[PDB]
């Protein structure tokens, strides 16, 4: 294949220069499990067991024994296939644009295939991270003109059947009121028998600025960490800041029994076999990626929204 | 079959894509091994 | 200035570190969403018709015909790219639909637009053009808008 | 060469005793990359990619796919070649000056070539450190009689298009006002998607003396570190003191994606081949060095100047 | 490749049947040199030296010596890539269009790839020769509807800053008036220190026919051609003079030296027709191929070309 | 590397194009060697 | 070619200069390997 497909060869030689997605920092290693599905839906079955009665004492003769039952629950996850197209120079035409210390027309913004693919892959990975965090797909700073998505395709911020708290616009700068809402949400969380787990908190830059203010020589960040440690059996509490968030606070456990990410193994950018060629020096290539796969249990995510208007 | 190996010689585009997927999985595992929160 | 990608050097790198709203630049050539079956032509350029509706122009006959900015009843297509070294303008014929950013005369999504005498887009009469977004200001005199052109009304 | 060139042999044998430049402490290992040049300019091209529209869903048949564009930017860096001359004893005359455990005329301040070269190299390295920190070349404590340099040759302190804050003379001794200006500059910093980076702070001795004061049991230094940690995603904040500065505060990230040092590989002192000889015992030698190569993005350095009058 | 690309194999097997360009007769072997480029510009630097003062006599002890300076000038040449498309029959469909006397569809004007390529290459070579001689690109006999070219792309006939002579309409038949203008131009030529070089003259067929008349009463044993050769030998240090006839010219006479120090042709190494890799294919028996060629690269020193235009109107 | 040499076997289209250019140059040299003004 | 390499013997002053540059580069790398903050 590498004797015939120079584009495949170049992708192989440059694939290692693409940085890892930052979304890996929001999950534990055991929480991510790949699946083999480009487009469509997959059904996940979770089995359970329960005790019907008190156990039976074995003494002398007895035939009537207490029983243990079983239960099943089916969850459907939707996956979507998306594509991008980009232009580049042709392999046979690179030599006529190999300048000093660089290759490509600065005037016409034409690049060799390897560089163009690397840059496009980086941008697509940023888009994938934004989807995984927010659950929406948009390229505008306003977050508008969103691409309509399929049902059963959620992110951490828009997962339904979770704890939602809202801070009024009159209290938008009152860290005490924000913390009161946070404590209410933390009380309404339901971890069951899986409470002993590390916890993850994601905040926006403005909230990050407010967290370092003195608590009203203690900081609001320290108070929040202690409050979460009160409920998570004093496990580790991690705090992360993302510019992808605006006036939002996300709190969720890092336990694979509650929240699990099952992305397609083709989720990250992959070259397409089709290459558009003509009599000129410009060719076009395509990049494929797959979205969807977040699975969560009910009432295990706390989402605090600070209204601004 | 991963793109990391120099011994790996893909026969066709499907094997190339599978190698890309395996490489992504291995880089994810390596990132979590080298991650120290 | 009046160039798609002027050759200018600076002392510092520009602060473009994000993946949102990075495409609102004058050097962004071609269409935002392009088909592999589009018909593309090139003509000698008279003036600077980049990102404007063009029309056929003839001289004394000594030299071959060229294209210049202009619309109305003379509209022949849309200029989507320019090569400065050769003076060649890339034209998409009006018989081929186009989606991309075009120069706007100094507007909300859904409004109907048409090409004026200078080849700029203006609010509405004889051209199928619909604004897909609001106006973006690149310069005190330069405004661009995302529009879809799909023939003659 | 070593059999014929005694001076080259001596330089090779004594090059190791010169201490490392202190400018290496202001940069991360990835930020420094050498270039092959002595005098002139060198244009660097930075390539970027962007998304033009929302991605395209691959379902059924479709020919019209969203595109990814590419953009470029060119930056020019100037370099300057500078030279010094020093007198030393000739090789053949050292025997007539080898005293008890020391060589050279104390009365006439004449030294062997190796010792003279080492001392001169140390002084030149200190001058280079001053240029890198300040962007000016001067040998006076006042900082005047500056040598005129080329455009596109800046240091960390005079880099244009950065966040400049000025503290008025009436507030020269008010740490609260200084910290107010620091907070304003920290807010105006634009790190974008590269905010998760270690940060570096450089202060002057008077500023450090003010920082170790109590915060009007927490110190101003701790408050400043917390404020910077609020924007750099809770990563390391290093504080350094330099006597080269006067009433200045410098804050900038240690990220190679925002600030890059591209020095010439001949920047550090290098002997010149020419040696001035005559009929006496005194010779002259020349040392070459190269200045320039600092590259930064816009609005990534906070420069605070505390006006004293 | 030849086991995979029949079109490449056929081009390789039929390339030798395309005749050499006639422009090779307008230059000396040393005047032509290839450059590696398809589209773009290229600069050439010429270095000169001069004496600042009289030489210094070396006697006894002297430290002050006269100096020699240096200077340079830069010339930029432009190149342009051009392409044509032609239809032919798909290779696998030739068996159904074979005939006892030929292969191809006469009623539809369809040829096999080899023959179509040969004919197209011949036509393109004719166009290239016309450009090299005249410096313009057109497919009309009138010379109108000219393709707009780049600056610094000139031919022998339109090279700027040369010597131009214009013979009036009423004297179009007077060979004596023509020679008067030719002698004036030859006087105005400036070959500098390279004057001892062979010279080349290119004339239109009508002028070539006029040059065989007896010299004028008419003189025996001598013709106007001999008179012209002697006149040019009067300025080229009695070196060789060559005469050529080209139907591309029209009432024009062109005289220039065959010296690489004065006039040099640096064409691209891809100037002559070259097949493109792309071949359009579909469900029918008709395919399309493309041919590329590069124009540009004539460099000449100023006031070394004489152009005489005999006006008819 | 010329089309004149039948022993030459191109591996790809770039080598084929280089061979065409070399063949043109060789034919020009042959023409000037056989030219007699 | 580095002055830290004892076996290295330069032929000319140009090679000596390159060796000095490589020595400075290696010392910078060693400093960053030994630097603790």
UniProtKB/TrEMBL annotation, chains B, F, G:
- Top-level taxon of the source organism: Bacteria
Q: What is this protein called?
A: Uncharacterized protein
Lineage of this protein's species? Bacteria, Pseudomonadati, Spirochaetota, Spirochaetia, Spirochaetales
What is the organism field in this record?
Borreliella burgdorferi (strain ATCC 35210 / DSM 4680 / CIP 102532 / B31) (Borrelia burgdorferi)
């Amino acid at each position: 294949l590498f004797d015939e497909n120079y584009y495949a060869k170049a992708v192989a030689n440059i694939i290692g220069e693409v940085k890892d997605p930052i979304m890996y920092k929001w999950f534990s290693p055991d929480q991510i499990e790949d699946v083999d599905l480009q487009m469509g839906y997959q059904k996940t079955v979770k089995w359970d067991a329960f005790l019907n009665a008190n156990p039976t004492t074995i003494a002398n003769e007895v035939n009537t024994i207490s029983t243990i039952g079983f239960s099943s629950e089916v969850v459907r996850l939707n996956y979507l296939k998306l594509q991008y197209k980009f232009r580049h120079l042709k392999q046979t035409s690179e030599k006529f644009y190999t300048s000093d210390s660089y290759i490509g027309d600065i005037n016409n913004n034409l690049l060799p295939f390897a560089q163009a693919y690397k840059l496009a892959s980086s941008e697509i990975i940023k888009l994938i991270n934004h989807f995984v965090l927010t659950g929406t797909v948009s390229i505008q700073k306003d977050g508008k003109n969103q691409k309509r998505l399929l049902p059963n395709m959620y992110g951490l911020l828009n997962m339904p059947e979770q704890i939602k708290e809202e801070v009024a616009s009159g209290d938008k700068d009152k860290m005490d009121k924000i913390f009161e809402k946070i404590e209410a949400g933390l009380s309404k969380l339901e971890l069951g028998d899986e409470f002993s787990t590390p916890m993850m908190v994601i905040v926006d830059p403005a909230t990050s600025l407010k967290l370092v203010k003195p608590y009203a020589c203690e900081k609001w960040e320290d108070v929040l960490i202690q409050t979460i440690k009160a409920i998570n059996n004093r496990e580790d509490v991690y705090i992360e800041t993302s510019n992808l968030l605006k006036h939002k606070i996300l709190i969720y456990p890092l336990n694979s029994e509650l929240i699990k990410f099952k992305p397609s193994k083709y989720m990250l950018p992959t070259p397409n076999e089709q290459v558009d060629k003509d009599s000129t020096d410009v060719a076009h290539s395509y990049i494929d990626f797959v979205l969807g796969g977040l699975l969560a249990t009910r009432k295990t995510i706390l989402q605090v929204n600070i209204k601004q208007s | 079959a991963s793109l990391l190996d120099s011994n790996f010689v893909p026969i066709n585009f499907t094997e190339f894509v599978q190698a890309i997927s395996n490489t992504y999985k291995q880089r994810r595992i390596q990132f979590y091994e080298n991650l120290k929160r | 200035a009046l160039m798609k990608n002027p050759q200018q050097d600076s002392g510092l790198l520009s602060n473009s570190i994000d993946f949102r709203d990075q495409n609102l630049i004058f050097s962004n050539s071609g269409g935002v969403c392009t088909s592999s079956k589009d018909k593309i032509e090139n003509y000698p350029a008279k003036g600077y018709p980049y990102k404007r509706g063009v029309k056929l122009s003839f001289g004394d006959g000594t030299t071959e015909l060229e294209v210049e900015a202009g619309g109305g009843d003379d509209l022949y297509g849309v200029c989507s790219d320019i090569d400065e070294f050769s003076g060649m303008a890339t034209v998409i014929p009006i018989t081929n639909n186009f989606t991309g950013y075009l120069t706007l005369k100094k507007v909300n999504p859904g409004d109907k637009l048409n090409f004026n005498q200078h080849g700029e887009l203006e609010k509405v009469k004889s051209v199928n053009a619909i604004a897909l977004s609001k106006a973006h200001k690149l310069t005190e005199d330069l405004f661009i808008v995302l529009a879809s052109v799909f023939g003659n009304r």
